[PDB]
Design an enzyme around this catalytic site. Structure first.
Site, PDB file in Angstrom:
ATOM      1  N   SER A 156      -4.445   4.123   6.136  1.00 43.86           N
ATOM      2  CA  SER A 156      -4.515   5.266   5.240  1.00 43.86           C
ATOM      3  C   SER A 156      -5.938   5.629   4.867  1.00 43.86           C
ATOM      4  O   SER A 156      -6.209   6.768   4.486  1.00 43.86           O
ATOM      5  CB  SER A 156      -3.680   5.033   3.983  1.00 43.86           C
ATOM      6  OG  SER A 156      -4.347   4.189   3.062  1.00 43.86           O
ATOM      7  N   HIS A 164     -10.386   4.772  -1.193  1.00 45.08           N
ATOM      8  CA  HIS A 164      -9.836   5.863  -0.428  1.00 45.08           C
ATOM      9  C   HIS A 164     -10.747   7.043  -0.619  1.00 45.08           C
ATOM     10  O   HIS A 164     -10.784   7.954   0.197  1.00 45.08           O
ATOM     11  CB  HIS A 164      -8.424   6.135  -0.904  1.00 45.08           C
ATOM     12  CG  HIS A 164      -7.515   4.960  -0.725  1.00 45.08           C
ATOM     13  ND1 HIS A 164      -6.376   4.768  -1.478  1.00 45.08           N
ATOM     14  CD2 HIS A 164      -7.592   3.901   0.118  1.00 45.08           C
ATOM     15  CE1 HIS A 164      -5.785   3.648  -1.102  1.00 45.08           C
ATOM     16  NE2 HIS A 164      -6.504   3.103  -0.136  1.00 45.08           N
TER      17      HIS A 164
HETATM   18  P1  LIG Z   1      -3.503   2.800   2.960  1.00 46.70           P
HETATM   19  O1  LIG Z   1      -3.020   2.576   4.360  1.00 46.70           O
HETATM   20  O2  LIG Z   1      -2.274   3.066   2.023  1.00 46.70           O
HETATM   21  C1  LIG Z   1      -2.293   3.922   0.927  1.00 46.70           C
HETATM   22  C2  LIG Z   1      -1.455   5.134   1.188  1.00 46.70           C
HETATM   23  C3  LIG Z   1      -1.698   3.222  -0.245  1.00 46.70           C
HETATM   24  O3  LIG Z   1      -4.143   1.512   2.374  1.00 46.70           O
HETATM   25  C4  LIG Z   1      -5.479   1.224   2.509  1.00 46.70           C
HETATM   26  C5  LIG Z   1      -5.653  -0.246   2.343  1.00 46.70           C
HETATM   27  C6  LIG Z   1      -5.987   1.615   3.858  1.00 46.70           C
END
Ligand SMILES: *P(=O)(OC(C)C)OC(C)C
EC number: 3.4.21.105
Length: 173
Positions: free
Chosen positions: A110, A157
């Site tokens: 993500s 993020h």
């Molecule tokens: P992401 O794949 O997921 C979020 C949507 C919560 O998580 C990070 C660790 C890459």
């Protein structure tokens, strides 16, 4: 249909998700996670492979769904190489930031998905001529899977998202 790089990521995510369902999450993490002891600092796959692990059916599915549409668009309109750079950098940077605030025990595509959302969007606003853009409604559902990530519905993020924007800036010139 979908290019070689979009394809492979999904496969690897799947194989690993399968590997995780069989062996256990800790077990696969033990081999694929961001380094968690100094003996593992040289195993250079680890700075990247954390992206390949998903922890629920809904985790992988959404990441891969978003990866499928966004990743596959960049590769068609812009080339396999471009997708690779975006993937490499965002996994490293978001992984780094993630690791820094929370720890080496994470996974998921993500961070990369966020970079793609930011990249495709900005690149379509500032370089519409190129044939890349995030359609309006998708911007809404993207802002959601962003919001999903930001309120834990962890932190790094913004890094993923930043890298995405940063790169879209450069290419618009
Ligand atoms: P992401 O794949 O997921 C979020 C949507 C919560 O998580 C990070 C660790 C890459």
């Amino acid at each position: 249909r979908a290019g070689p790089v979009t394809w492979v990521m999904m496969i690897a995510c799947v194989v690993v998700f399968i590997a995780m369902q069989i062996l256990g999450d800790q077990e696969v993490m033990l081999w694929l996670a961001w380094p968690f002891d100094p003996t593992l600092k040289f195993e250079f796959w680890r700075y990247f492979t954390h992206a390949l692990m998903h922890f629920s059916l809904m985790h992988i599915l959404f990441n891969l769904l978003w990866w499928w549409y966004l990743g596959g668009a960049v590769e068609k309109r812009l080339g396999s190489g471009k997708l690779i750079v975006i993937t490499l950098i965002s996994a490293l940077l978001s992984g780094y930031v993630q690791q820094k605030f929370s720890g080496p025990w994470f996974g998921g595509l993500s961070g990369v998905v966020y970079a793609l959302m930011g990249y495709v969007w900005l690149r379509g606003e500032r370089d519409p001529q190129s044939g890349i853009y995030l359609q309006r409604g998708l911007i809404i559902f993207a802002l959601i899977w962003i919001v999903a990530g930001w309120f834990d519905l962890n932190g790094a993020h913004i890094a993923g998202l930043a890298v995405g924007l940063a790169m879209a800036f450069v290419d618009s010139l």
